Amino acid sequence: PELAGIKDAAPDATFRIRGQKLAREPHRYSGRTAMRANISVHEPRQPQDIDTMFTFSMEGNNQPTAHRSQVPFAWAPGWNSPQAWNKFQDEVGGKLRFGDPGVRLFETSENGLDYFTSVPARFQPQDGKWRIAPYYHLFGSDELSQRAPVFQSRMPQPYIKLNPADAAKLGVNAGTRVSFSYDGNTVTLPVEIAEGLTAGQVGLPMGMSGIAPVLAGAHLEDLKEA
């Protein structure tokens, strides 16, 4: 029952605009008798969509005045660019004409919570243990986006962040390779000197190859120059 709002996130598969479905592709969609002609000259059956109100064809509705909230793409006659979204809005720069899609699952509660009494103690750098400070990257921390080949040229090379005091204590410079063991597995990374990172912490790029996001807030042992 807590997920009961997902019924109204979009209308069901029987929803129509004056009897017709919602088109997935523009009216001037081309190559319909040739896009699959090398596999067979016989045109295949148009893919049926029993799940949703959209159709896998142009035989549908994408009018800007159509009473719906799910707009697959914005096109209007004379407006082929993204400026056709002006035609799809009630006022330009406002909302969609018949409401924005999506429904909030919960409202604001009538009463609040109590104050959280458990105030933590201050961070104390213990010898031989390195607190893992999470460093997130827009290109590299999300799991599936790493798999995108265009992100590898944009993803930074993975280093480890060190305080100048901790790096001087360990005798390591910027760029040298240090090896650390987490869960009994030694891995090696180069070093950058992070001035803003507090001493007793080591900075790790979350979500990269070999570094799980679960490592945030964990501790490190035997981190030393390889």
Binding site: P26, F56, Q70, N80, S81, P82, V92, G93
Partner: protein, 227 residues
């Protein structure tokens, strides 16, 4: 507020300018430099309408609809002959230096400049002189750069600097040698640099990842989805 466009009365928001008020009413005014999220600057001079002082007025005055408030009791004309001639002239001035690039341009069929050139009714070229050209920059793996197609509408710099808070994009140079890009070759550092491919009304900033396996907008199968 109450406005009268071409003899038709409309009720609009008085806090809006005339361009967004008329676009919200379904009227078609060509525009380049205005964006709903960026505000009005009055650069491209494309959104000209003829404003009259009162209902019994024949002369009028050409004004920028994006810079003119949609106050109560306004009188304007979009389809006035002089206003149409000026909008066509602005499109013609933008076309003097524009490259012959639409077949090999990723913005083709999705281009705001194409749509406004067609909308003003400008299809005859009388300019016979040379067109200015520009070298391109390497902007990283995501954005492809082609400064020949620029119409100097300043939307990229306004979005990237004022809206997105980026620092490595700017406008350089002078009179008709205005260059929009980075001070040197390199990757655009903003996390929201990809919106330039929709902010730019021409094919200057394009999706390089799409440009690898390119197809036109009419050939796409679209669906509404969540990132």
């Amino acid at each position: 507020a109450t406005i009268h466009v071409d003899g038709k009365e409309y009720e609009v928001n008085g806090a809006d300018n005339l361009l967004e008020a008329c676009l919200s009413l379904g009227l078609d005014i060509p525009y380049f430099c205005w964006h709903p999220a960026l505000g009005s600057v009055g650069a491209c001079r494309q959104c000209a309408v003829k404003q009259y002082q009162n209902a019994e007025d024949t002369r009028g005055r050409l004004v920028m609809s994006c810079m003119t408030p949609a106050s109560d009791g306004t009188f304007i004309s979009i389809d006035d002959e002089e206003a149409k001639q000026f909008r066509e002239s602005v499109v013609e001035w933008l076309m003097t230096n524009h490259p012959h690039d639409c077949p090999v341009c990723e913005e083709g069929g999705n281009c705001h400049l194409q749509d406004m050139t067609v909308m003003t009714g400008h299809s005859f070229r009388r300019y016979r002189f040379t067109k200015r050209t520009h070298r391109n920059q390497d902007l990283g793996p995501f954005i492809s750069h082609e400064m020949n197609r620029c119409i100097a509408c300043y939307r990229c710099v306004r979005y990237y600097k004022d809206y997105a808070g980026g620092t490595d994009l700017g406008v350089y140079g002078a009179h008709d040698n205005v260059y929009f890009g980075r001070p040197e070759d390199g990757t655009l550092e903003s996390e929201f640099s990809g919106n330039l491919v929709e902010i730019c009304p021409t094919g200057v900033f394009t999706d390089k990842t799409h440009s690898e396996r390119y197809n036109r907008k009419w050939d796409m199968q679209f669906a509404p989805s969540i990132c």
